Design a protein around this ligand. Structure first.
Ligand SMILES: Nc1nc2c(ncn2[C@@H]2O[C@H](COP(=O)(O)OP(=O)(O)OP(=O)(O)O)[C@@H](O)[C@H]2O)c(=O)[nH]1
Ligand SMILES: */C(S)=N/CC/C=C/[S@@](=O)c1cc(C(F)(F)F)cc(C(F)(F)F)c1
Ligand SMILES: [Cl-]
Ligand SMILES: [Mg+2]
Lengths: 203, 1015, 120
């Protein structure tokens, strides 16, 4: 296990933190708590070429909460630029994020991601998205909510960093599992009587 | 670690260098605290005074990078504010430390990040000071370039970044006047920059200096005159020499691409020839130095050595960019024919690469080409052989169309798709367009290819799921391009062959693939089906067999195929065909229960929707109504039995099986109504009064359950089921009214029982029990018949306005549907029945104005737009009232509320996406006083002198507002901005420009007030 | 290959955050019941789709009881004292939702078969 610094950039509310959390814990955070500066999160995938670890530098998209700004990109070995397909202004600012990113990270694999494709009223159409071609970025339509192509940016980055385009995610074999009380039935009560979110979802 | 925050003591650099090392090279909790210390250190306003100390004494390159970040912020914002000895002093240690790092070969090699930042930080100074306070910069930069090679190379980085900041990223970040000032300054001194740039290119050949010089060249190509490129040898150097070394190749190919994209003075034969020549050279170097035209570029990209993928990406971008613009230069001359076809043969090979985004880049080109070949006389014969290959490339890489609902999973079985693949829909459309054009350009070649592929699928020598799928999807995609007689035999052969595969191939899996392809093909060829009834009948009966299939993909696709066929072939179902005792719609309706027995409820509703499409084709009103009645036999009998039981109770609805029966009856009514529209009225009339009674009964039980079990009840299955019944009843009415032709019967029969059922119920329920679909249903009622029921619009407002506004004014997050549907309803009311807002008592009309400015402040795009649109339309509404008491009292109460609130969202950074509409709204408000369309004074009688014009008071108000809102602006900056802003209120593109200038000046101190005299 | 697959079904798993007082998704994918042929002891093993990361790995203990969630007719909520999906053996309050009530009922039925096998 070698580790690669990934920087995650993009406009406010595009779904960067939601995306990372989804990969870390499996959760879908519905609240928008704006990142202050950066949150570093280790994130491991298991491949047929061994474990690959990313140090995911989850940067802040809002200007006022920006922090060190381009200082977060130093020694980054890859990156994800994120925008929201339900707002044009986040796609319009993709060149600004890229510009600041490639000034520091001159030669690194970058993914461009169009988040929130699960929303019906799509504003940035598929044919509009072409900025990645000249700048040699990989592009994926994604949704942190529906998990649409959620694994692709990491699969692709892993292939480039390890340098094997036949690299695949694999399942690690699971060890056989093993064979407070006054608050555990209190949790079990409030859990049964708290409703599971999104009960209209197909799962 | 926290000692660096305290500036009462001197800054400890060795401490700083470790908190930085802890941040980048460390982890965990130590990393998190170190980042907070660094952000507070950065954000301290006196931190820049420590930057020269850091640049001299610091040992850590990242500490120095952050020191330059603090300066970057100082220079872009508070530069003007500084004493002139600080400005001239900061310039000295930046210029002095850039040259320091370039003399040290090891620092120049190993610390490129710190050098690029120092260069960027210099360019920020140049934006401020150059050329007015630094006239000698460019001649001294050229003078320094002769001495050292590291200095020369780094100057190319400074000139690159300066070109970026002035021409590429100035539109947002600078005032119009200052962007123009800087562009003209560079444009004025580019003569001697290019002279250096070009002599360096002739004297290096391949190295880091040559790359950096070519990097800056790429930026110059974005803006410089055409004479610099075409009246110098430089096209020869790019197209020959710099193509041969791989270090220069990537950046050269990008330069040439930018050059290639230019439009040519087509009068000139010399530039035309030069444009042919650099292409001719570039292609020659690719053939000799990289790979020949025959090379398997698919395998190369897939192996992914070095920059091979980036190179092939850039080649594709270069070839397509050039050939889209300039391929006509190669098309007449017979000696240039081989060059034209080689370049296209490279694209044919690039197009075989498995990489979707690259494929889209190439496909976009092929579309451009085949489109031109379709319309341009005498072009298609040139590309016969290129097109012939492209048909094969596209047929073999057809993506799964939307309609095909079966896929292969990671296990390796043919399974229903879990979700829709949203990203391949545009890719399919793009492929179909190109493949359609190619089929038109040679219909014989396309048939032969597809049939010979289909022959090898039968004999088994090329059988797989990928091959048969792609073939069938392509066969389907080209529906329309053959003649009727050719399609006749073509489709017969395809079907008869696909049926052969059905027989031979065994298993659950194989049978599902072939059926999904047969379904796709059949559904794509309605013209065939219409001319061949016996076949159409057989198809439809086979689809009905598939509705009983244990495989769900096949089942679900048969329903979608059925609906798809009937949308196009409906007429052949309503007539009585030869050899048939009756119309086929009769037969379908008769066995409807038997046919749909194994279908899920939503699939049954599609089936009913399909029957609806057919029935609406019957133009005899007696017979259409009868068919409608026969179709609705099962749901009407279920419905009549439910009302007899609900008459006896109405507590029997608590039984959740009854709730589901009810919901599906309404859903079936909704489904038939969507296809039938205005023709559905007789079925609606049959159930309408009992339905709105059931709405009340269902609404009782919801409220009763909320009181009995708490707000949590709204999450339970039984209540959500009861809520569904209400949503679907509202959907049915919304759907009918939205398509109804006879608006008199809507107003007389439907509207008044509806309002009585839903409005008082909505109003009297708790927030969490209120269905937002009430609001949506009313939006449609007002939209279609709002003008006809002005007294009914008032009743809608009174019931939904204040209780809904109270749900959505605590924060921006809660009740998101209600939020959205609320402002839609207010929007359509304000357009269609504005009178309703005049009858609101004064205090409620205040809440309405508060409701609109609340919409402005939303980040939510749907709310924000409707907020700004209501504001716009409200001003027009009040304007058209003329000089009357309500308009006068409006302007006295709410004019400056709208002006100030519109100004808040322009200026606060967090409502950027509404800039256009905000600007338009603000222009319309300001226009009123400069046309004198506000008849009364806008001020208190003794606030200003007597008889002062509204134009004077408006400037005086805004001056004061902005002065308090932005105390760092000077009086002159404000006075200049408003002078400009007011007299541009009949010129929106300039008005918007003057706003963006303002937005730039408020992010800094000491902005130039003359900037606002730009137009 | 050490384990017989007794029952497999597509599902969405949640864990209850007690402090936030809300449910959070842990994974979506195939929930398998795996019968160890050496020990004859059944466990839940669940992997996330695509990434194949383990979102549930615990014994179907006899002590556990499947209780309904107030908001769902196609889910079960239960307390689990030893899940080893994310490394160390932690306690959790899981809920698990399925595509339909029919699937949820068959899950309950098979979960209790598994409990009787683990009881021996
Ligand atoms: N519909 C939909 N919503 C999403 C998706 N991803 C994220 N969101 C929502 O949009 C918001 C995004 O929040 P974050 O992920 O914190 O945004 P961010 O990019 O981290 O923003 P900053 O922290 O300001 O940089 C949240 O409220 C999410 O629930 C998605 O794929 N689909
Ligand atoms: C082989 S693929 N066996 C399983 C499915 C059978 C297909 S053929 O019976 C078939 C399918 C269809 C379709 F898809 F319904 F349109 C039509 C026809 C027919 F030839 F038109 F009858 C046959
Ligand atoms: Cl002044
Ligand atoms: Mg964030």
């Amino acid at each position: 296990q070698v580790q690669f610094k990934l920087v995650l950039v993009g406009d406010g509310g595009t779904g960067k933190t939601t995306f990372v959390k989804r990969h870390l814990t499996g959760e879908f955070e519905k609240k928008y708590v704006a990142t202050l500066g950066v949150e570093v999160h280790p994130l491991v995938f298991h491949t047929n070429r061994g474990p690959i670890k990313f140090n995911v530098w989850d940067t802040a998209g809002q200007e006022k909460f920006g922090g060190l700004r381009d200082g977060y990109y130093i020694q980054a070995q890859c990156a994800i630029i994120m925008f929201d397909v339900t707002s044009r202004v986040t796609y319009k600012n993709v060149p600004n994020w890229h510009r600041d990113l490639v000034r520091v990270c001159e030669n690194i694999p970058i993914v461009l991601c169009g988040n929130k494709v699960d929303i019906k009223d799509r504003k940035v159409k598929a044919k509009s998205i072409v900025f990645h071609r000249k700048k040699n970025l990989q592009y994926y339509d994604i949704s942190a909510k529906s998990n649409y192509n959620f694994e692709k940016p990491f699969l692709w980055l892993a292939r480039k960093l390890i340098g094997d385009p036949n690299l695949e995610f694999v399942a690690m074999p699971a060890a056989a599992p093993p064979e407070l009380a006054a608050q555990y039935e209190h949790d079990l009560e409030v859990a049964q009587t708290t409703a599971l979110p999104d009960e209209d979802d197909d799962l | 670690m926290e000692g660096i925050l305290d500036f009462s003591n001197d800054l400890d650099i060795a401490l700083l260098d470790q908190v930085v090392s802890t941040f980048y090279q460390g982890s965990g909790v130590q990393q998190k605290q170190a980042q907070e210390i660094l952000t507070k250190f950065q954000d301290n306003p006196d931190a820049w005074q420590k930057a020269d100390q850091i640049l001299q004494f610091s040992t850590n390159p990242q500490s120095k990078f952050i020191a330059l970040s603090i300066l970057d912020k100082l220079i872009t914002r508070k530069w003007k504010l500084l004493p002139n000895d600080h400005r001239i002093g900061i310039r000295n240690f930046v210029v002095g430390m850039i040259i320091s790092m370039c003399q040290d070969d090891e620092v120049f090699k190993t610390q490129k990040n710190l050098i690029n930042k120092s260069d960027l930080t210099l360019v920020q100074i140049l934006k401020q000071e150059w050329p007015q306070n630094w006239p000698e910069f460019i001649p001294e930069l050229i003078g320094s370039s002769s001495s050292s090679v590291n200095v020369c190379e780094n100057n190319m980085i400074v000139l690159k970044l300066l070109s970026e900041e002035v021409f590429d990223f100035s539109a947002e970040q600078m005032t119009q006047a200052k962007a123009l000032h800087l562009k003209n300054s560079m444009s004025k001194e580019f003569e001697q920059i290019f002279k250096l740039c070009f002599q360096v290119l002739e004297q290096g050949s391949s190295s880091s200096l040559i790359v950096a010089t070519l990097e800056s060249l790429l930026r110059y190509l974005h803006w410089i005159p055409y004479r610099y490129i075409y009246e110098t040898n430089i096209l020869e150097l790019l197209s020959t020499k710099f193509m041969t070394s791989p270090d220069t190749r990537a950046i050269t190919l990008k330069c040439l691409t930018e050059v290639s994209n230019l439009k040519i003075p087509q009068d000139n034969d010399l530039i035309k020839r030069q444009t042919v020549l650099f292409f001719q050279n570039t292609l020659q170097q690719i053939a000799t130095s990289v790979m020949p035209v025959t090379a398997d570029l698919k395998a190369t990209y897939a192996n992914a050595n070095g920059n091979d993928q980036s190179f092939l990406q850039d080649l594709a971008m270069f070839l397509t960019t050039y050939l889209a613009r300039n391929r006509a230069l190669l098309e007449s001359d017979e000696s240039l024919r081989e060059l034209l076809l080689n370049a296209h043969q490279y694209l044919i090979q690039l197009s075989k690469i498995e990489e979707r985004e690259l494929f889209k880049t190439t496909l976009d080109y092929w579309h451009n080409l085949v489109a031109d070949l379709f319309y341009e006389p005498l072009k298609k014969h040139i590309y016969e052989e290129i097109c012939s290959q492209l048909r094969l490339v596209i047929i073999e890489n057809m993506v799964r169309p939307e309609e095909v609902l079966v896929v292969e999973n990671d296990e390796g079985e043919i399974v229903r798709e879990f979700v829709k693949e949203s990203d391949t829909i545009q890719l399919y459309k793009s492929e179909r367009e190109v493949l359609v054009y190619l089929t038109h350009l040679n219909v014989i070649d396309t048939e032969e290819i597809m049939i010979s592929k289909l022959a090898r699928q039968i004999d088994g020598s090329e059988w797989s799921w990928h091959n048969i799928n792609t073939l069938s999807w392509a066969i389907g995609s080209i529906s329309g391009t053959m003649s009727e007689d050719t399609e006749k035999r073509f489709v017969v052969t395809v079907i008869k062959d696909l049926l052969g595969l059905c027989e031979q191939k065994r298993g659950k899996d194989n049978k599902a693939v072939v059926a999904s392809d047969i379904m796709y093909v059949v559904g794509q060829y309605p013209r065939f089906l219409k001319a061949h009834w016996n076949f159409l009948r057989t198809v439809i009966l086979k689809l009905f067999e598939f509705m009983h299939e244990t495989h769900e993909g096949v089942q679900d696709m048969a329903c979608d195929t059925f609906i798809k066929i009937v949308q196009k072939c409906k007429y052949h179902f309503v007539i009585q065909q030869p050899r048939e005792s009756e119309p086929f719609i009769q037969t379908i309706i008769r066995d409807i229960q038997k046919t749909t027995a194994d279908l899920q409820p939503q699939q049954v509703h599609t089936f009913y929707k399909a029957c609806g499409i057919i029935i609406s084709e019957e133009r005899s009103v007696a017979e259409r109504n009868r068919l409608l009645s026969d179709l609705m036999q099962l749901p009407n009998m279920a419905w009549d039995t439910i009302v007899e039981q609900s008459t006896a109770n109405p507590t029997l609805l608590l039984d959740s099986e009854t709730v589901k029966i009810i919901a599906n009856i309404i859903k079936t009514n909704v489904a038939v109504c969507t296809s039938m529209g205005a023709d559905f009225y007789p079925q609606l009339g049959h159930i309408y009064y009992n339905m709105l009674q059931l709405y009340r009964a269902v609404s009782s039980m919801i409220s009763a359950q909320v009181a009995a079990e708490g707000l949590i009840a709204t999450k339970t299955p039984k209540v959500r089921g009861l809520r569904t019944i209400k949503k679907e009843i509202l959907k049915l009415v919304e759907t009918y009214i939205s398509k109804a032709r006879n608006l008199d019967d809507v107003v007389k029969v439907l509207v008044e029982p509806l309002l009585n059922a839903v409005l008082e119920d909505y109003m009297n329920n708790v927030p969490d029990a209120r269905d937002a679909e009430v609001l949506n249903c009313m939006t449609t009622v007002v939209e279609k018949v709002g003008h006809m029921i002005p007294q009914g619009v008032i009743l809608i407002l009174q019931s939904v306005f204040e209780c809904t506004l109270d749900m959505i004014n605590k924060d921006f997050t809660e009740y998101p549907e209600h939020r959205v549907e609320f402002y839609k309803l207010l929007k359509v009311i304000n357009e269609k029945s504005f009178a309703a807002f005049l009858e609101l008592p004064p205090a409620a009309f205040k809440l309405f104005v508060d409701a609109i400015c609340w919409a402005f402040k939303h980040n939510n795009r749907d709310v924000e737009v409707n907020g700004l649109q209501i504001a716009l339309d409200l001003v027009k509404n009040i304007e058209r009232m003329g000089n009357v008491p309500f308009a006068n009292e409006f302007h006295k109460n709410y004019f400056f509320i709208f002006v100030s609130e519109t100004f808040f969202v322009l200026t606060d950074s967090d409502h950027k996406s509404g800039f256009s509409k905000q600007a338009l709204l603000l222009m319309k408000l300001i226009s009123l006083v400069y046309d004198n369309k506000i008849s009364v004074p806008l001020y208190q009688e003794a606030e200003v002198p007597q008889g002062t014009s509204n134009q004077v008071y408006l400037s005086q108000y805004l001056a004061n507002m902005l002065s308090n809102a932005f105390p760092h602006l000077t009086s002159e900056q404000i006075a200049s901005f408003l002078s400009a802003l007011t007299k541009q209120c009949k010129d929106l593109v300039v008005f918007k420009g003057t706003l963006r200038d303002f937005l730039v000046q408020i992010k800094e101190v000491g902005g130039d007030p003359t900037d606002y005299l730009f137009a | 290959e050490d384990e017989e697959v007794l029952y497999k079904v597509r599902a969405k798993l949640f864990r209850f955050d007690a402090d936030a007082k809300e449910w959070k998704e842990r994974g979506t994918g195939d929930c398998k019941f795996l019968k160890n042929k050496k020990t004859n002891k059944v466990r839940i093993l669940m992997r996330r789709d695509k990434t194949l990361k383990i979102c549930a790995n615990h014994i179907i203990a006899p002590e556990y009881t499947l209780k309904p969630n107030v908001g769902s007719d196609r889910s079960w909520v239960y307390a689990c004292t030893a899940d080893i999906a994310e490394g160390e053996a932690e306690a959790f309050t899981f809920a698990i939702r399925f595509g339909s009530k029919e699937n949820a009922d068959k899950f309950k039925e098979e979960f209790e078969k598994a409990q009787e096998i683990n009881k021996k």
